[PDB]
Design an enzyme around this catalytic site. Structure first.
Site, PDB file in Angstrom:
ATOM      1  N   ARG A 106      -1.501  -1.706 -15.507  1.00 42.80           N
ATOM      2  CA  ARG A 106      -2.611  -0.516 -15.113  1.00 42.80           C
ATOM      3  C   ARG A 106      -2.023  -0.080 -13.580  1.00 42.80           C
ATOM      4  NH1 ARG A 106      -7.341  -0.574 -12.958  1.00 42.80           N
ATOM      5  NH2 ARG A 106      -8.109  -2.679 -13.200  1.00 42.80           N
ATOM      6  N   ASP A 158      -0.605  -7.622  -1.046  1.00 45.57           N
ATOM      7  CA  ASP A 158      -0.781  -7.491   0.507  1.00 45.57           C
ATOM      8  C   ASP A 158      -1.567  -8.904   0.312  1.00 45.57           C
ATOM      9  OD1 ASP A 158      -2.838  -6.689  -0.484  1.00 45.57           O
ATOM     10  OD2 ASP A 158      -3.490  -5.252   0.810  1.00 45.57           O
ATOM     11  N   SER A 169       1.519  -3.832  -5.137  1.00 46.31           N
ATOM     12  CA  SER A 169      -0.092  -4.509  -5.238  1.00 46.31           C
ATOM     13  C   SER A 169      -1.348  -3.341  -5.819  1.00 46.31           C
ATOM     14  CB  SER A 169      -0.652  -3.599  -3.081  1.00 46.31           C
ATOM     15  OG  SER A 169      -0.763  -4.912  -2.427  1.00 46.31           O
TER      16      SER A 169
END
Lengths: 471, 479
Positions: free
Chosen positions: A158, A196, A143
């Site tokens: 990132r 998620d 996630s």
């Protein structure tokens, strides 16, 4: 219960009610703009909302059977979950949780993945001591910001949530994990990488056929739902023939970035400061306006304002109220929940934690402030729910919800159900009969990832596409 | 969504530790027969308590001599006095087994626990006054009848009286033990000229009983399963020998009579309850050695302490925590109820929640097989406590010939101890041997109680006022 509050504090309270109240008409307006931005994110011009295709192109039926793994990678722990689906909207789970050695967060790539593989091997070796007939398909909940040109891929954009490992950003993490699994000879095929919220959507649809959305209402804010391929102009020209225009497509909205442009959200000067002093000013506007993470900060700045103007905390030590993020979500939560006529809970909190002694009337103001804040947050949160339902034409829905705010912020579920009721102007007595209602989600990052792995493996085994042509 | 229960594989546990886990299973399991034998002694002790001579179980009449019909209507006050907080509660009985309530909750200032008589009752009467001032800003046409939940040890010759025997829960106020507390409250009420008559003093479990019977016509007992344990139920006057010769004719032999059992003291003799060497250590280093035997075997307060002493035994015997510093573990009551709770809640096969809790809170590193013992131990302890609890339920039901019942349960163990409801349903199914599939279908079953100390006190005040206005008796002759 406000009858003993002096008029000069009473006035300042009416001003705060002005600033923080979101009318039904305002929610409705926001929803129209939100829908427009959901459409933009799925189109070619794109927009502030990513609307990331999740490459799940079908609904779970409840009829799925088998053993599937999931790996839930968090900032501090991972979970490994074995899910056996019983084929009647039911499942059984067997799961372990492993704390990440703290050196890894800031370590090198290979040693993150080799530790994850160490956890996978130990798990599989226990549950399948004589090995498997066929590799266990695994779904990986990852996630962090990441793009996916196909389900079994995730290129890290990132690091978030603490991590800071060199040479991962800009690379596909799925082969990085799969190769460490291979080096340890573990009978696992990583077949899907998910967010998620996509997991939340699918796990909950498997057990509760009425689910139309998965939503996280926590320090994170996100929602996932099924769109349809013909409504995703940004995939035109990119799809193989076997993902055709009537195909469902799960979308991970990533809508914490809704209205970065600041055209519609009712930002106060307190929100402007929160944004200005955040790690990324100008970003995540909808998240900063709805996430639980900022609710105590909104309070802190308002009180500091009232103090600096002479209204409250006369002669108190204000040094701890000046520390950004000193008040987490537990402040508005404990304050809304104070059962005491004299607000003895709110008193402990300020005395013990902030070294501020309050009067009863200042606790009354503080409590009213916590309610405004909590209620504002819920009302803006359900604007995302309304927008997805109105965009897709869902007049009825279960909105499968998870997250620490939905789950643990007192009265939050009532605040949300009222906010929907106010948006749709339903004539309906009890929240359990609301046509669109939030309901507790199934496990998105474990069960949900395993179910997506089942759906994915079936397609891979058939040679059905799970991504753009050529990937 | 609570996760699935964990598998619980014991396949990696070495033989010598597995011996010890099997030994704990032998020690802490209460068989069905033992529960039956305990229930039959419990019954004779319930009968014994109701006699003039009496016994270890106080069996205190609560002077509620009718069942609430659920058709009652009106506005009734309750004062719920706790060890830490008090509530003033208004209940509007909606007269279809339903009601609405509002309360004001107040924290007792710290000086009262140790202050004077006048200071405690003057503080109460002030909270009463604030409440009434908000809800009745114009005054009232007739006194508001109030029920006073005062759960300290007290005797009552009539419903509107309560003579304190001994302060508990830290209270240290002289000049109250041996005095009737109702006029002390009433006089501070008067000194401030509030329109309130205190017409009933109850124990909270009596309240649980009566509040739940008002809302649920199938209720036949009220039970508290928390840090303290108690039960209340309706007996019949002819079954209460200690009242023989003391009753007026209008409280006839066939009259119902609620009883506050106070049965935490069943088996102070230490004959029937299955005490381990660990229960013995608990009893000996408690503030009242030899007292409260049933409370010690069923209350949530001791569950972590049982675990602590077992683990310390196993450590001292060389089986677990082999190269650990066990320092924090030597502290009595370092493990509260939240220990076996969190352990039974752990959803992981490697018991990572248990691992975290022992590392963080006790500074102890555990291996996975030591965690598997720890988890098994917590299950055994929660399960024993639930099975012995149900023996009190079974004794009351059997005593009164209840073949079916809703057992109105409250208290932090019933409400928050993991799997407690399943354990207690299983226990009752093992005693009675029912041919039944679903626990929702058990002839005798625990259901969540209504609020005994607020709603139940207000309903009792309702029932009582009606009697007082008619000149119907609510205590012994002449009282």
């Amino acid at each position: 219960s406000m009858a003993d509050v002096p008029a000069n504090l009473m006035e300042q309270i009416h001003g705060l009610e002005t600033l923080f109240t979101v009318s039904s008409e305002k929610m409705r307006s926001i929803v129209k703009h939100f829908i427009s931005e959901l459409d933009k994110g799925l189109s070619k011009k794109g927009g502030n909302i990513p609307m990331i295709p999740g490459w799940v192109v079908e609904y779970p039926t409840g009829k799925e059977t088998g053993d599937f793994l999931a790996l839930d990678l968090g900032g501090t722990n991972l979970r490994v979950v074995l899910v056996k689906l019983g084929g009647n909207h039911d499942f059984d789970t067997t799961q372990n949780k492993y704390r990440l050695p703290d050196h890894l967060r800031t370590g090198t790539s290979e040693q993150l993945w080799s530790f994850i593989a160490k956890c996978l091997k130990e798990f599989v070796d226990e549950w399948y001591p004589d090995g498997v007939s066929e590799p266990l398909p695994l779904g990986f909940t990852f996630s962090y910001p990441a793009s996916q040109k196909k389900i079994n891929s995730g290129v890290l954009q990132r690091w978030t949530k603490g991590f800071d490992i060199e040479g991962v950003e800009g690379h596909d993490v799925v082969p990085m994990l799969q190769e460490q699994i291979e080096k340890l000879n573990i009978p696992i095929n990583v077949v899907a990488l998910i967010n998620d919220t996509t997991g939340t959507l699918v796990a909950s649809l498997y057990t509760d056929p009425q689910t139309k959305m998965g939503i996280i209402i926590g320090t994170g804010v996100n929602g996932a739902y099924y769109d349809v391929v013909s409504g995703i102009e940004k995939l035109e020209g990119l799809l193989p023939e076997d993902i055709g225009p009537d195909s469902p497509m799960a979308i991970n909205c990533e809508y914490g970035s809704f209205d970065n442009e600041h055209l519609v959200l009712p930002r106060t000067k307190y929100d402007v400061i929160i944004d200005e002093e955040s790690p990324r000013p100008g970003q995540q506007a909808f998240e900063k306006m709805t996430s639980g993470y900022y609710l105590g900060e909104i309070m802190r700045l308002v009180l500091l304002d009232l103090y600096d103007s002479g209204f409250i905390f006369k002669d108190q030590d204000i040094s701890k109220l000046k520390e950004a993020y000193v008040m987490d979500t537990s402040y508005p939560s404990k304050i809304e929940d104070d059962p005491f006529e004299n607000l003895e809970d709110t008193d402990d909190l300020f005395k013990t934690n902030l070294n501020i002694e309050t009067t009863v009337v200042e606790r009354k103001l503080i409590r009213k402030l916590a309610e405004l804040v909590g209620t504002r947050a819920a009302r803006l949160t359900v604007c995302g729910v309304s927008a997805i339902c109105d965009k897709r034409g869902y007049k009825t829905a279960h909105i499968a919800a998870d997250g620490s705010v939905f789950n643990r912020y007192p009265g939050y579920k009532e605040k949300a159900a009222q906010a929907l009721k106010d948006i749709y102007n339903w004539d309906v007595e009890k929240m359990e009969d609301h046509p669109i209602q939030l309901v507790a989600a199934e496990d998105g990052s474990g069960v949900g990832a395993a179910i997506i792995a089942c759906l994915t493996q079936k397609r891979l085994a058939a040679g059905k596409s799970v991504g753009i042509k050529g990937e």
